[PDB]
Paper text:
DNA polymerase (DNAP) can correct errors in DNA during replication by proofreading, a process critical for cell viability. Here, we present an ensemble of nine high-resolution structures representing human mitochondrial DNA polymerase Gamma, Polγ, captured during consecutive proofreading steps. The exonuclease (exo) site is located ~35 Å away from the polymerase (pol) site, with no direct path between them. Altogether, our findings suggest a conserved ‘bolt-action’ mechanism of proofreading based on iterative cycles of DNAP translocation without dissociation from the DNA, facilitating primer transfer between catalytic sites.
Analysis of the Complex TWO dataset resulted in structures representing the consequent forward translocation of Polγ relative to the conformation observed in Structure II by one base pair (bp) (Structure III, “Mismatch Locking” complex) and by two bp (Structures IV, V and VI, “Guide Loop Engagement” complex). Structures IV-VI reveal the same location of the mismatched base of the primer relative to the catalytic sites but show notable changes in protein conformation. Structures IV–VI show similar overall conformations. The most notable difference between these conformations is the gradual motion of the G-loop, accompanied by the straightening of the thumb and rotation of the palm subdomain of the Polγ_A subunit, suggesting an essential role of these elements in the proofreading process. Compared to Structure III, the palm of Polγ_A gradually rotates relative to its thumb subdomain and Polγ_B2 by 13°−26°, assuming its most “open” conformation and changing the trajectory of DNA by 15° within the catalytic subunit in Structure VI. The transition to the G-loop Engagement complex aligns the 3′ end of the mismatched primer with the entrance to the narrow channel leading to the exo site. In the Backtracking Initiation complex, Polγ has translocated 1 bp backward as compared to the G-loop Engagement complex observed in Structure VI.
Author numbering:
A (entry chain B): 64 to 160, 170 to 355, 362 to 485
B (entry chain A): 78 to 249, 262 to 316, 340 to 495, 534 to 626, 738 to 997, 1050 to 1232
C (entry chain C): 66 to 355, 368 to 485
Write the structure that this text describes.
DNA sequence: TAGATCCCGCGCGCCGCAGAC
RNA sequence: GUCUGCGGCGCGCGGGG
């Protein structure tokens, strides 16, 4: 069919995701995949960097925060759904005499990261001089319980890891609605930014069972819409519940009055967003062009420039690339260290390999580069060659990225 | 009652002289065409005590009502007519406020002009918003001027209710205001934006001119060209183009008015306005004087051309309109602009992606066989352990600098060599425009966009070679209609679409995106997305300027009455304003109000960004809009006129029979029920019938059929003369055009050439330009259209005068009639809304009866005696149950649901206390 | 020496209440996390490590390793940080117990459910299978990764019998597969490079020290301690595990885990380098600490480079220029503190004292002179000396300064 | 029917100002 | 002397309300 199956080819192959012959959309969405390949990690890091730049940076009164991956044992209400079994089957009580059986007062792995932000809000209140409008952002990996709901061979609930970026924003209650609408619009812009087909990203409104109104963002995967980013009006009730001893300490200042801030949580899944970007970048029937390529945005592609050499009469002279490669490493431009395999690989094969690898530009150094230095530059978006010059490379690439950053 | 369906009346004597011969003629006519035998379904009878009437008949009643409505303002009009003004003052004052110029030019500061009649004109500068800058008026006593507090230098930040002028005394009585485009002048008057009504009424000279020797559109297309082709030009001297200078020249004998070359108000800044204060004041006073002279020359002529007082009363009433906004207007504008901007950006990205993907066709000369990009140039021209190794060409390389003999073209002089020529042209420069990476500078208007998308059919070049999109586009030198393309070009022929670009066509592609052989096709990724993007964008693309820049004035808290206060919806930092439509009471040869942004046939249509414009017109708290649409207005008027020409029975002509009995659902209605069955398309036959009743011919019908769908000439209305054969079987002789079919058009033709007032109901005269007596001419289609449109206008005037009479007789807090495409709306306080509905129903009972009273009829069918539904809503929309597409949902705004009412409203009376609800 | 806990807690540098962090547990993973400045310092140090190790070597690739271990038929003797290893309700080590049918070995005991990882070497060995294809049979290469590792703690002041606790340490781990020949050469090269890297950002590199150790399992081992005043700690470990660890996994089959080095097929030998980034930040902060309250931290590792403030002057017409300069300096990628919006007119001396406690590289003062001619005052952290400067000439200088910071 | 004409947009030549071979 | 990539005037077409 080629829908979610052909993509998995040239996905595990070019190490954008772990290679275990899974090819299961359910496994990926669940987060039970063994892991992501180096290119997948690089792409996720690029997406996280873009999110940080567009959230913490170009936005005042935003500060970082870190949340622990594990929670303390004591004072832990609730219990695991699968763990709770006491209906029957208690014939063997031969055991002599925390211990116990109701959760054992033991620890618990975190499912959500905004709890740490809520806990650290009290310490971060003094950062903005108790100014009500301000937020804390954090990117972190959370482990969730997932069960296939089929058979009993799986047995205990599986656990899936997923990286999410959560921002908790404290705003005046009066302007909570308009601030939430503006935040939803900004997130929609950001997701539509770096999007090859922005229409696939969609938004919807939802009503909480308590009565709180929120927004849900979905990506239209080939099989169906999947939630990626969720905005919820926390309602401030749980913050008060965490500190019932005295609320006179937590009241922030807005204008010239003191009020308890309203909390909005915007949580986006970097694990599911990256898959959405992968799917969107990939395009089939009566196309007459072929040439499968992952057209990721230049601003968050994993690899920018790939270096190579060709028809070099004196291969020893290839060190012209060396240093230049190092020069490209300065100012944070990622490069694919080619010119090492040196097998008899056809130019078209190498170009296809780089295209499937989502490389913006391909640089080839030839014998005509030592004097009047011109290097053959090929573009991912258009398979067309250029000559250009060495001294114009670095800045140009930076310009390109900069010009990609803002439309 | 009964007798094929009539209503019960409490006014009028027995009458009932139809004639046995008339009965026999009606029966024998209905035997053919339609079927005589139809038991039908009798409707329930309604009994109600109408308010007392005036005079002997209904015509005298309406005449008395209109006279009582107009006399207080006719007095002021006559006072202005008989007044004489001294020469203009030599020097105009500079003080802020209103200054009166007594004789010899003595300037005195006065709070307001205590005058009952003025000729008004206002100047506005486009630099500092739309606030007025200067104004001057003349009364029978002397001149007055207003400087707008322009001289002071202080920021105000717009959004002020005190900024415009002031013309109403505090009063703690009529004050007619005449002007040219007087709606424009009244938009900057203040105290017209108050929710409570205002006693002042306005008169417009363009409305006076459109009624008296107004000009059509086709005729205006030739009146400038001489500032079947053969015709009589004897109408030039009496007609003009409605401009103030031309109108003054036509109606007043004198030198042409000088036109200011600088035009500082429209193209200029505030400094020039201050510098040229005296010249601009003189020009404005000259315009005021010209308007006064035109009004003096026109008022007796108007009264002679429109003898019925109801016409003047309705024209006066229609000049006062009101569109409250309730602070959702600017939010709607912001949402629409954001949707437009992001949709345009996504479209641009899609076109850039298509351009990028198109480059691959040259990698193996694959463009040569592509039917889309075969003709493009596709041209490419060139024209210590580790430290020692670290110091190895660390930064660039030693002597790597190129001598530049080959590299002598920097930046644009060497623009992307190797790339295709078209892609090179699309891309920006390397340095100056920030290089905007990708094939930028691409938009739908570019020729390059075709052949990068769309192109259904076989060949759709759209090349600009005096043919636009070339194609035979039908079955049966080579590649004339074939798919692959690459024609020999021995001789390009414009086959299939023989008319070429000569025929007007329309925006017949946006409708046609739904299949219509207009789609991207092989793309499947971004081609279609651009087409749907254009679909959602096209409305706001060429209308955002008009919808935006609408003058909105926000009242202060103290300005609102107690009705707005003491309501659940109040304050909350609320802004309450209103928009005056700035609508000419007459803008066509027919006296129908013209407005490009409010009087248009548009509604909340999905897959459109700028839709729901009519929505968001939200009444203030404690107020609501009671509205009604006339059920098949023009069709009913034509049918009743035809039957009255035939005999006294309403259903005698077999056309009013269908109108009264036929139903949209499970009925043989001409709209969506009968015309479509004989025709091809469905719901397009409504336009077909509306165009045929207004006058047309076989060529126009054939062209319209081509517009609806693609058929050869034979399948068009060339061999398909059956519709013309039936319906209107004109050009019939040996009978002394009359009858012989289901439609009577003979009465309209007789009215066209009668030379009388020519309006059967209220006797409003036709424009002197189109009078057959004044000039011999053969523009018959314009007159037969005008008679029905003017009948509709007189219907509207009758409703307006009746509604004002009912609202003044009983304490109903409702005013501000708004007319939109024959629909009427009234803003009324909620606690009396039901009354406003009931009275409105009575209007339809009375107005229709007036149309029945004339043309020698005395009964009205029960079906048309009342409005189908009357909507008591809090916003303006096509139907009471509607939603919006571009926003999340109508519930996002405070858009509740209305009440069609109809039958429930009959259970009450019209007195202040109904069913003991009061107190 | 003393009172460093209080000053560290103040200025939002460390997140926690008074005396909660205490002297003990700070080395241990399970202590209240750091402040936003600490997180930024953690983010900058990781970026510097990535620059030094990953990209500058052109042979080291990122790897992904899940925090959890499924542990199918896992051996019954291991770290057992969380034997249950399921979401919520980890039973910790649960030594002994599980004798009855409930919570027994046949399901959910003996670590059949799995465990919580303690190092990234295992993930590197798991990813070797496809990383070998990634490098196209090239044997000498490595995998680097910065990630959280979970460890067990004990003898916490022996206040109450230990029930164990999860200590989270953000460790940077490099696993280098090298041919068995010249493995010692790679070990020595990595040791030297790590020593130079840790000495680069230190104001007093003499504090850092290196030592050698031998183990029966490892051919050679090296350790960096930093020689803390209270005693010799451990800041970095380098070990030559050998090929037997790799041979432990993939027991079946042969000629699959070997690569091509010098056109010769050979089984790789693995070298593991582990550095506690949290320990690395603490040592650097102590090195910065020295007699005013000022910390001399390297410019590249400064969590915040420059800060903006306004002294007296008109309230209006200064926020516009401040916002414009904010936008310009954010566009080029240097973070700036938004200190110009603080109200109440804080004391200038107190402002300077707090800014020095901030460790921000420079303080910018804007007055009406900036409106008149775009001239501002720049104050240095170490010299505490103010100089007049032009508004348009700051940007380049800052990046120029960082170049001087980057260049040795 | 009732069409609407300056206007805005997208192309073109003709006339020059610079500039490396 | 070329041949061009940078400015100002005309001209063709269209669409709109």
């Amino acid at each position: 069919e080629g829908s979610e199956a052909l993509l998995e080819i040239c996905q595990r192959r070019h190490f954008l995701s772990g290679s275990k012959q899974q090819l299961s959309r359910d496994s990926l969405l669940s987060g039970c995949h063994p892991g992501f390949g180096p290119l997948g990690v690089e792409l996720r890091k690029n997406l996280a960097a873009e999110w940080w730049t567009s959230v913490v940076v170009f936005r005042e009164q935003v500060f970082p925060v870190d949340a622990l991956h594990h929670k303390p044992g004591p004072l832990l209400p609730g219990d695991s759904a699968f763990r709770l079994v006491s209906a029957e089957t208690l014939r063997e009580i031969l055991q002599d005499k925390f211990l116990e059986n109701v959760l054992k007062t033991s620890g618990k792995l975190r499912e959500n990261l905004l709890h740490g932000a809520l806990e650290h809000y009290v310490n971060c209140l003094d950062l903005v001089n108790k100014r009500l409008p301000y937020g804390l952002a954090q990117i972190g990996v959370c482990f969730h319980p997932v069960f296939d709901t089929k058979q009993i061979r799986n047995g205990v609930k599986s656990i899936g890891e997923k990286t999410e970026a959560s921002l908790v924003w404290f705003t005046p209650p009066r302007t909570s609605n308009q601030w939430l609408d503006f935040w939803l619009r900004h997130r929609l812009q950001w997701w539509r930014k770096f999007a090859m087909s922005p229409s696939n990203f969609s938004s919807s409104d939802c009503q909480d069972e308590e009565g709180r109104k929120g927004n849900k963002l979905y990506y239209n995967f080939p099989w169906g819409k999947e939630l990626i980013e969720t905005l919820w009006n926390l309602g401030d009730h749980e913050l008060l519940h965490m500190y019932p001893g005295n609320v006179s300490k937590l009241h922030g200042r807005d204008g010239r009055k003191n009020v308890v801030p309203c909390v909005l949580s915007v949580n986006g899944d970097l694990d599911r967003g990256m898959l959405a970007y992968l799917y969107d970048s990939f395009q089939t029937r009566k196309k007459n062009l072929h040439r499968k390529v992952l057209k990721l945005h230049p601003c968050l592609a994993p690899i920018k420039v790939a270096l190579d050499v060709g028809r070099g009469p004196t291969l020893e002279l290839r060190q012209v690339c060396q240093g230049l490669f190092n020069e490209l490493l300065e100012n944070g431009i990622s490069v694919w260290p080619g010119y090492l395999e040196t097998m008899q690989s056809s130019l078209e094969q190498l170009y296809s390999k780089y295209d499937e690898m989502s490389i913006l530009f391909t640089v080839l150094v030839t014998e005509t580069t030592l004097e009047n230095g011109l290097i053959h530059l090929r573009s991912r978006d258009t398979t067309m060659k250029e000559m250009m010059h060495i001294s114009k490379l670095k800045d140009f690439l930076i310009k390109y990225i900069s010009s990609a950053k803002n439309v | 009652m009964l007798s094929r369906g009539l209503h019960e009346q409490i006014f009028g004597q027995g009458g009932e002289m139809p004639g046995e011969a008339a009965v026999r003629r009606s029966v024998e006519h209905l035997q053919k065409h339609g079927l005589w035998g139809q038991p039908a379904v009798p409707l329930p009878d309604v009994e109600l005590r109408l308010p007392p009437l005036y005079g002997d008949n209904l015509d005298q009643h309406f005449r008395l009502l209109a006279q009582k409505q107009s006399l207080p303002y006719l007095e002021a009009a006559n006072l202005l007519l008989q007044a004489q003004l001294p020469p203009k003052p030599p020097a105009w004052a500079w003080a802020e406020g209103w200054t009166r110029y007594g004789p010899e030019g003595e300037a005195v500061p006065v709070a307001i002009p205590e005058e009952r009649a003025l000729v008004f004109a206002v100047a506005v500068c486009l630099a500092e918003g739309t606030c007025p800058t200067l104004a001057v008026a003349i009364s029978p006593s002397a001149w007055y001027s207003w400087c707008s507090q322009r001289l002071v230098e202080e920021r105000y930040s717009w959004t002020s209710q005190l900024s415009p002028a002031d013309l109403i005394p505090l009063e703690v009585q009529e004050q007619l205001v005449v002007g040219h485009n007087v709606s424009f002048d009244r938009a900057h008057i203040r105290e017209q934006y108050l929710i409570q009504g205002s006693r002042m009424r306005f008169l417009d000279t363009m409305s006076m001119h459109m009624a008296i020797s107004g000009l059509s559109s086709f005729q205006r297309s030739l009146w400038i060209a001489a500032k079947p082709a053969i015709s009589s030009w004897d109408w030039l001297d009496i007609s003009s183009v409605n401009s103030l200078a031309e109108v003054h020249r036509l109606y007043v004998g004198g030198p042409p008015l000088e036109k200011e070359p600088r035009e500082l108000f429209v193209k200029g800044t505030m400094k020039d306005i201050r510098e040229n204060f005296q010249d601009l004041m003189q020009y404005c006073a000259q315009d005021v004087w010209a308007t006064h002279e035109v009004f003096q020359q026109q008022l007796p002529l108007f009264l002679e051309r429109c003898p019925h007082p109801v016409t003047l009363a309705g024209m006066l009433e229609m000049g006062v309109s009101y569109l409250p906004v309730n602070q959702n207007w600017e939010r709607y504008l912001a949402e629409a602009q954001g949707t437009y901007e992001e949709l345009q950006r996504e479209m641009k990205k899609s076109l850039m992606d298509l351009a990028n993907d198109a480059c691959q066709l040259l990698s193996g000369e694959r463009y040569k066989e592509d039917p889309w990009l075969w003709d493009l140039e596709w041209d490419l021209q060139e024209f210590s352990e580790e430290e020692e190794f670290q110091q190895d060409v660390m930064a660039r390389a030693c002597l790597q600098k190129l001598k530049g003999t080959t590299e002598l073209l920097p930046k644009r002089p060497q623009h992307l060599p190797g790339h295709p020529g078209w892609y090179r042209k699309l891309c920006p420069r390397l340095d100056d425009p920030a290089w905007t990476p990708g094939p930028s500078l691409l938009s739908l208007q570019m020729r390059v966009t075709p052949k990068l998308m769309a192109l259904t059919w076989d060949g759709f070049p759209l090349h600009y070679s005096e043919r636009h999109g070339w194609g035979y586009l039908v079955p049966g030198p080579y590649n004339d209609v074939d798919i692959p393309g690459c024609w020999f070009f021995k001789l390009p022929h414009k086959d299939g679409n023989s008319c070429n670009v000569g025929s007007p066509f329309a925006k017949d592609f946006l409708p046609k995106m739904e299949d219509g052989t207009l789609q991207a096709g092989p793309g499947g990724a971004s081609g279609p997305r651009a087409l749907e993007i254009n679909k959602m964008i096209s409305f706001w693309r060429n209308a955002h300027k008009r919808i935006s820049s609408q003058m909105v004035v926000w009242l202060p808290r103290s300005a609102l009455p107690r009705a707005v206060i003491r309501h659940p919806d109040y304050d909350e930092e609320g802004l309450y304003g209103a928009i005056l439509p700035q609508v000419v009471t007459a803008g066509t040869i027919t006296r129908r109000a013209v407005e490009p942004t409010w009087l248009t046939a548009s509604n909340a249509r999905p897959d459109r960004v700028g839709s729901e414009l009519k929505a968001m017109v939200q009444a203030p708290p404690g107020y609501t809009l009671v509205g009604a649409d006339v059920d098949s207005q023009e069709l009913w008027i034509a049918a009743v006129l035809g039957d009255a020409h035939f005999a006294g029975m309403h259903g005698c002509t077999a056309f009013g029979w269908m109108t009264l009995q036929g139903r949209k659902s499970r009925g043989t209605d001409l709209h969506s029920k009968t015309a479509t069955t004989v025709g091809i398309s469905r719901e397009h036959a409504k336009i077909f019938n509306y165009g045929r009743i207004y006058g047309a011919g076989q060529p126009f019908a054939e062209r319209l059929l081509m517009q609806f769908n693609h058929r050869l000439t034979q399948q068009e209305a060339a061999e398909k003369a059956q519709q013309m054969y039936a319906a209107t079987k004109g050009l019939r002789w040996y009978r002394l055009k009359g009858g012989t079919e289901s439609e009577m058009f003979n009465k309209l033709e007789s009215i066209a050439t009668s030379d009388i007032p020519r309006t059967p109901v209220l006797g409003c005269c036709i424009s002197r330009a189109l009078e057959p007596s004044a000039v011999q001419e053969e523009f018959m289609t314009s007159r037969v259209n005008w008679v029905v449109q003017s009948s509709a206008v007189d219907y509207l005037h009758l409703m307006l005068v009746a509604m004002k009479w009912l609202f003044e007789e009983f304490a109903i807090d409702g005013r501000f009639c708004i007319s939109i495409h024959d629909e009427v709306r009234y803003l009324v306080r909620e606690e009396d809304r039901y009354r406003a509905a009931l009275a409105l129903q009575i209007t339809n009972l009375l107005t229709r009866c007036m149309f029945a009273y004339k043309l020698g009829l005395n009964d009205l069918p029960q079906s048309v005696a009342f409005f189908s539904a009357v909507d008591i809503d809090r916003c303006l929309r096509k139907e009471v149950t509607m939603d919006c597409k571009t926003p999340s949902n109508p519930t996002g705004m405070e858009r509740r649901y209305g009440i069609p009412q109809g039958e429930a409203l009959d259970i009450y009376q019209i007195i202040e206390l109904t069913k003991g609800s009061l107190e």
